[PDB]
Design a protein around this nucleic acid. Structure first.
Ligand SMILES: [Mg+2]
Ligand SMILES: [Mg+2]
Ligand SMILES: [Mg+2]
Ligand SMILES: [Mg+2]
Ligand SMILES: [Mg+2]
Ligand SMILES: [Mg+2]
Ligand SMILES: [Mg+2]
Ligand SMILES: [Mg+2]
Ligand SMILES: [Mg+2]
Ligand SMILES: [Mg+2]
Ligand SMILES: [Mg+2]
Ligand SMILES: [Mg+2]
Ligand SMILES: [Mg+2]
Ligand SMILES: [Mg+2]
Ligand SMILES: [Mg+2]
Ligand SMILES: [Mg+2]
Ligand SMILES: [Mg+2]
Ligand SMILES: [Mg+2]
Ligand SMILES: [Mg+2]
Ligand SMILES: [Mg+2]
Ligand SMILES: [Mg+2]
Ligand SMILES: [Mg+2]
Ligand SMILES: [Mg+2]
Ligand SMILES: [Mg+2]
Ligand SMILES: [Mg+2]
Ligand SMILES: [Mg+2]
Ligand SMILES: [Mg+2]
Ligand SMILES: [Mg+2]
Ligand SMILES: [Mg+2]
Ligand SMILES: [Mg+2]
Ligand SMILES: [Mg+2]
Ligand SMILES: [Mg+2]
Ligand SMILES: [Mg+2]
Ligand SMILES: [Mg+2]
Ligand SMILES: [Mg+2]
Ligand SMILES: [Mg+2]
Ligand SMILES: [Mg+2]
Ligand SMILES: [Mg+2]
Ligand SMILES: [Mg+2]
Ligand SMILES: [Mg+2]
Ligand SMILES: [Mg+2]
Ligand SMILES: [Mg+2]
Ligand SMILES: [Mg+2]
Ligand SMILES: [Mg+2]
Ligand SMILES: [Mg+2]
Ligand SMILES: [Mg+2]
Ligand SMILES: [Mg+2]
Ligand SMILES: [Mg+2]
Ligand SMILES: [Zn+2]
Lengths: 114, 50, 60
RNA sequence: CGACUCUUAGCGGUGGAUCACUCGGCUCGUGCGUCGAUGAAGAACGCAGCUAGCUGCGAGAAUUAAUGUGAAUUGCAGGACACAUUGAUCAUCGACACUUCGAACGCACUUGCGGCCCCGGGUUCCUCCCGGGGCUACGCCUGUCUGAGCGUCGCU
RNA sequence: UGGGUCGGGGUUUCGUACGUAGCAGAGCAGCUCCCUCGCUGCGAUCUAUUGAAAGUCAGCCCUCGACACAAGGGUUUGU
RNA sequence: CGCCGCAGGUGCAGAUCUUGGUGGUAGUAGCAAAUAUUCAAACGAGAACUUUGAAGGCCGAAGUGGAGAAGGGUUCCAUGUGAACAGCAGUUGAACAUGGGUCAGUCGGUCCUGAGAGAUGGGCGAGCGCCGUUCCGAAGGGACGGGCGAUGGCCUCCGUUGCCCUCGGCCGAUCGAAAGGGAGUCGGGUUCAGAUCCCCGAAUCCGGAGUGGCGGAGAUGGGCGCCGCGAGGCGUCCAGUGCGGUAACGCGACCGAUCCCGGAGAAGCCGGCGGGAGCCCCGGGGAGAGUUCUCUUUUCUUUGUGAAGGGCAGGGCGCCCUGGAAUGGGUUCGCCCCGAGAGAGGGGCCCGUGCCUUGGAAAGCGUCGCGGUUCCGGCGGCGUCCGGUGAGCUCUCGCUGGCCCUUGAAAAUCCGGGGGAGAGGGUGUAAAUCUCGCGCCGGGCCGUACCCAUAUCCGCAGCAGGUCUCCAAGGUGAACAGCCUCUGGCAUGUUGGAACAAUGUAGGUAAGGGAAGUCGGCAAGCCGGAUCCGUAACUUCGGGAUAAGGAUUGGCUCUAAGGGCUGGGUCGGUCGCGGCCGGCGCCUAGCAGCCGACUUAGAACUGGUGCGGACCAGGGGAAUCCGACUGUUUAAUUAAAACAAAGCAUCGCGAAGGCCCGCGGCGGGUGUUGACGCGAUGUGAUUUCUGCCCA
RNA sequence: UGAACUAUGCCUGGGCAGGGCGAAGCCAGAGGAAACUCUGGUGGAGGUCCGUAGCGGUCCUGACGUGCAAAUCGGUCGUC
């Protein structure tokens, strides 16, 4: 079998020296130095363990040359927060603001007595 | 090694250049007294200072 | 192929060749020799022929 | 008969003593008694037609100018040089020049990266690229400018 | 005449060679105008040829078969 | 040089004297670790050693192979020489001599921080200095925003520019990794020696574009009055910082500052599964070779498609919609999951290294020829095909678990969101703006050859030592074991020839006996794999345990079991010998055909009882002492009972503190700490005890 | 003047065949009046065992002992 050699002077099996096999048009097998596996964003909620949908998973400096649509989702907090926790915060914001109106009404009616 | 600094490479360059025999016409000069380069250095015999 | 000053960079080599030979150059590759002299490979523009330029220089 | 061994001598080797030589030391004495941010000492790298060392020198690089001298330098070559419309060589040295480190000075170095102001080019002024030049260390004195203080006051 | 080198014979060691043949062989896989109990392969092993095959002086024994070679070389030695 | 005086570094056999030279020893010891060489020829004065060819061997992919890091520094590559060197030789050489050789935006350095190092302020110090790294500093020199203006000029209007207002804590310089983080280059060709760097061809990242390079987006629609048969035009007014999907989210852009929030960078070890590839394997089709004494449609070799795009499989999802589940269901090798929304149906997203396609056949490769440019990326023909398998090996991606009094970096850098200060045009010739498509320019500096080791490094040397890694074929086998082989490599390790004495060194065998030898079974030998049985005392109940002990094992011929794929129709009642619905039927104890692994069990036959046939590969039992165990230790005479250890116990300390460093500073370590902590001791697991004595 | 060897702490990397034993957890079956127990699988723990590479260095008191070596070599070994 045809055995392989590194193509760079880094001779150690480090996290930056990862390769894959490739057959060239010259019918020889060579190393191709792969890029690291990118990660999708985690949600800003800090609760949901899954990563965000609709966002391309690339290394951080690749995001500079990606277009805007590939990095977010068309929604409030889109591309930074999960849809589930956005729904929860919309309801939580509304209901707590309602509760403030409750205590304001309750205190205003209870102060009618001198 | 293959990886070297510019100072190391320049030091090795001068050591290489002066590691040559004396010209033969030196031996015909008046009051010569010099027979051969006594400062010849072989890479395997004597290692460089650096 | 030229032997150049070790301090000159590719931009200086490019301009120096262009001025004192009246030729256009495409790119300059540069190494430093084991004896300490800098060597420059000066590729010429396609409309300049390196053969007859070396003839008028006198190194043919 | 020889071989071998021993002794002595002749000659030849090996070795470098002895002697003779001495552009070196050591000792004493004298006269001067002079380094450096205008960048020292020291180090590195370069520089000759043929040049590795030593020596000399700094990209003007085994030396430029000037002055004195007055026909060489030399290992080889080459080429000057009316020696008066000035001159080889050597000496002297007052002009000029003097790479990079180094107190070492933009920041940093077993790497490299800035900032400001001019000039030139691609621009065809507007600020991007390339090149060139000048600056950009710490401490400190005098003065200057800009300031701070519910420090001491004055006027309002 | 000689001694060699092959060959032959003897001795001896091991244990029955390859090939061929077999209605020998646990069986299995194909062919059925066939065959009327058969034919074509694979198959360790067995049987016969076959006490065969192979080795055997190099420090075994005898040859008188074949082949070539052998009246050559050097250094010395005297009462 | 003699004589008269003067002055000494003034007389050698020794000092294991100092330096230099030379003997005997002695043509002696020696040139013996890793199996091995032989034939012919060439060159040449000369050949055991050079070169070529032919054999026979070895390394045997955990290499004697192919490449790197450190280190070396020219040893690299040609040509020549035969002085010295390569412990024999040499026509050879890592020797000598003469020339040549290392080409980068995308391979690294460079950038970031890490453990740490280290200025300034401050403190100390006789002093050179050293302490300290946020501490006892007036430590932000920046900014689109706004204003006052110089209008410096294509003084239209936008750039510049000094000052003022407002905003501005990485709150600390700087250094610190060629294995950490870190955008983006691949394929083919080419040299005597360089190539991911040269050439050819395909890309791509970052940066810049002021007067704006081109498109596209923004963004160009409605209402009313009129003309006009209508179509279509004119005037006025009002919008317009994009759009789709229930949703997950999608579309080519998709205005927006200071400020805030978040993400990525950015995370251990181990297990078990699954997907993808490379390799290996099997069945054919070609091309070229090998064998052909006989047989063999045979045996061997070979039989491509880079990056970057587009599309499609495949994998994953703790993503969405419907709906509401117990007779609970789904489901994994294991798990695990569900009224906090299962099963089912339909979607969405991520990865896509696989396939197709652009690249692309024009190249490469294999063959077969034809011409030459003394040594043409020559010219040409033909081919570069179809399939199948897997607990296979190696990478990779993913899923899901386990372990921790252990929880497994930081920073550069990049991005998303929240908010809405602002900016832009009056319906146009549109404006501000644009993370969309295409176009233009640039990417400086340093390294880059070679060796990387039984000869290029360190060990005084071409030294059996030491020295960090990557790739990894066939057979046997449990296997990266040992043994044999292919690709690749080599010449047996600084000499050869002839003999086959003693004594060695290394390795075997030995009748009968069986430790009688010896301090002592030291050394050697016995045993050994796997399958089926069978296993005691004791025990901390886990072990002991492969206890002990026993049988079997080959070859050949079969048999049996262990799976995966599709298809199961009663029919023209008609026409798109086939298609739409249906009167028209009962596999429902499942069949039919095809395909493919190894493994197990059973049996017959068979050999001179031989069969784990080489290789691989535990002798066992009964006790006593010590140490609980695993671990560690005197590198170079001691591996132990010694040290450590968990466990037990004791002591100090509440921070103005305990213990400790410090020449010095209210300096520093524990301490990013706080009694379940830190510091100091002793004993040494478990079990059981731990008595008396404070003179 | 030295931590290029060694000792120890920290930072950042790399690496360790093939088998045996069979811990918790889980499934099923069986027995029982219950209480509960038994059996077969599954699973894959452990400063676990045999044993490579690696790391070490027991014995031969082997070789060598003007050595290959100013500490190396062979077998046998400890751990893995
Ligand atoms: Mg050396
Ligand atoms: Mg370069
Ligand atoms: Mg004599
Ligand atoms: Mg002069
Ligand atoms: Mg650096
Ligand atoms: Mg005041
Ligand atoms: Mg005979
Ligand atoms: Mg004396
Ligand atoms: Mg004497
Ligand atoms: Mg001898
Ligand atoms: Mg010998
Ligand atoms: Mg072999
Ligand atoms: Mg190698
Ligand atoms: Mg060579
Ligand atoms: Mg020799
Ligand atoms: Mg040489
Ligand atoms: Mg600050
Ligand atoms: Mg740095
Ligand atoms: Mg790195
Ligand atoms: Mg090369
Ligand atoms: Mg293709
Ligand atoms: Mg492909
Ligand atoms: Mg469901
Ligand atoms: Mg072709
Ligand atoms: Mg290289
Ligand atoms: Mg060695
Ligand atoms: Mg040395
Ligand atoms: Mg050797
Ligand atoms: Mg040998
Ligand atoms: Mg030999
Ligand atoms: Mg016996
Ligand atoms: Mg016996
Ligand atoms: Mg006895
Ligand atoms: Mg006795
Ligand atoms: Mg023994
Ligand atoms: Mg026992
Ligand atoms: Mg049998
Ligand atoms: Mg112990
Ligand atoms: Mg104990
Ligand atoms: Mg030890
Ligand atoms: Mg010891
Ligand atoms: Mg020992
Ligand atoms: Mg105890
Ligand atoms: Mg203790
Ligand atoms: Mg160290
Ligand atoms: Mg263990
Ligand atoms: Mg063990
Ligand atoms: Mg011994
Ligand atoms: Zn959430």
């Amino acid at each position: 079998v045809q055995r392989l050699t590194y193509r760079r002077r880094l001779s150690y099996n480090t996290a930056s020296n990862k390769t894959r096999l490739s057959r060239t048009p010259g019918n020889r097998i060579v190393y191709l130095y792969t890029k690291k596996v990118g990660k999708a964003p985690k949600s800003a909620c800090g609760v949901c363990p899954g990563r965000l949908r609709g966002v391309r998973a690339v290394r951080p400096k690749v995001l500079m040359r990606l277009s805007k649509t590939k990095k977010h989702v068309s929604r409030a907090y889109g591309g930074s927060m999960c849809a589930k926790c956005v729904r929860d915060r919309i309801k939580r914001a509304f209901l707590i603001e309602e509760q403030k109106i409750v205590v304001k009404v309750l205190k205003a009616q209870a102060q009618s007595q001198k | 090694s293959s990886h070297k600094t510019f100072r190391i490479k320049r030091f090795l360059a001068k050591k290489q250049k002066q590691n040559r025999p004396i010209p033969q016409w030196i031996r015909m000069k008046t009051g010569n007294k010099i027979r051969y380069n006594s400062k010849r250095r072989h890479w395997r015999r004597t290692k460089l200072g650096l | 192929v030229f032997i150049v000053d070790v301090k000159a960079n590719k931009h200086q080599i490019k301009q120096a060749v262009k001025k004192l030979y009246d030729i256009d150059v495409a790119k300059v590759n540069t190494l430093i020799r084991p004896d300490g002299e800098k060597k420059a490979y000066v590729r010429l523009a396609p409309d300049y022929d390196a053969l007859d330029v070396a003839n008028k220089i006198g190194i043919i």
